[PDB]
């Protein structure tokens, strides 16, 4: 049972660290009005979305794997699935928004003065949240427990999300693989590449360029495995379920959840201004 020991140990580690980090970021940003800029609004959005993702994903995704049974009700299944999808979408779109705001501010500093305002940031945050809530609609519809019997004649379930036909299932999964992984990835890579090129053409500049590289590397490493696994299941569920059932998919999900753990660290805790705000806020 060493593998389960590592599994729950890591789940607890990332859970506690992400929760504490998101709470600290939320408190500092909501308290110090001075620390309220266009980028800081998106940082607060990302912190809230990461807390949502942690709470509604991680505790509900280790249980059905340790107990191989879904114990909660249909309402909990539907609500948790809706919230996981919503939080993932909001986090990804907030990251893309931050990358685009930075790219504009560093590429056209005078031209972007027209539209980089707090009101524009509020419009963007509201549009992102509403779009996520609208697009993630099918999950509370088609999420329901599928029952099966175990060797001990005990009842068991599988919260699952299945569209009426496998063709539209594949279409849904391809649509997700596009809009939540591929397009955001290309946009972020292009934006940060332009920022790095403009900033390069000195020891601090190399550090910040490597930070921009780390951001993209962490995003891709955190989000490639889970989307690849979902597409693999959509194309041939049998082989994917046989190969990845149990610990492999649990660890892939943890690798995905680690994005919410790292985002506060890179975006806030490596900033001097932020560290000063944290020291001024907490004793």
């Amino acid at each position: 049972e060493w593998q389960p020991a590592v599994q729950i140990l890591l789940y607890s580690l990332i859970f506690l660290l992400s929760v504490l980090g998101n709470t600290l970021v939320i408190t500092v940003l909501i308290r110090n009005k001075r620390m309220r800029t266009v980028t800081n609004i998106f940082l607060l959005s990302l912190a809230v979305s990461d807390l949502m993702l942690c709470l509604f994903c991680m505790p509900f995704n280790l249980i059905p794997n340790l107990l191989k049974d879904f114990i909660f009700g249909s309402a909990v299944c539907k609500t948790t699935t809706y919230f996981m999808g919503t939080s993932v979408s909001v986090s990804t779109f907030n990251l893309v928004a931050i990358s685009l705001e930075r790219a504009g501010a560093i590429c056209k500093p005078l031209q972007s003065r027209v539209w980089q305002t707090k009101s524009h940031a509020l419009k963007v945050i509201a549009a992102t949240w509403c779009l996520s809530f609208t697009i993630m609609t099918p999950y509370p519809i088609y999420s329901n427990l599928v029952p099966f019997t175990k060797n001990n004649n005990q009842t068991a379930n599988m919260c699952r999300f299945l569209l009426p036909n496998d063709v539209m299932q594949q279409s849904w999964h391809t649509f997700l693989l596009l809009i939540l992984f591929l397009i955001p990835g290309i946009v972020m890579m292009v934006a940060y590449g332009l920022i790095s090129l403009e900033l390069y053409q000195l020891m601090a500049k190399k550090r910040v360029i490597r930070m921009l590289i780390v951001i993209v590397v962490l995003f891709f490493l955190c989000w490639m495995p889970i989307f690849s696994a979902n597409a693999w299941r959509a194309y041939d569920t049998a082989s994917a379920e046989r190969r990845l059932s149990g610990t492999p998919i649990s660890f892939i999900l943890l690798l995905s959840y680690t994005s919410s753990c790292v985002n506060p660290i890179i975006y806030c805790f490596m900033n001097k201004r932020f560290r000063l705000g944290f020291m001024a806020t907490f004793p």
Partner: peptide, 8 residues
Amino acid sequence: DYMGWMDF
């Protein structure tokens, strides 16, 4: 075997 997982 409770095979498979939840999408996210």
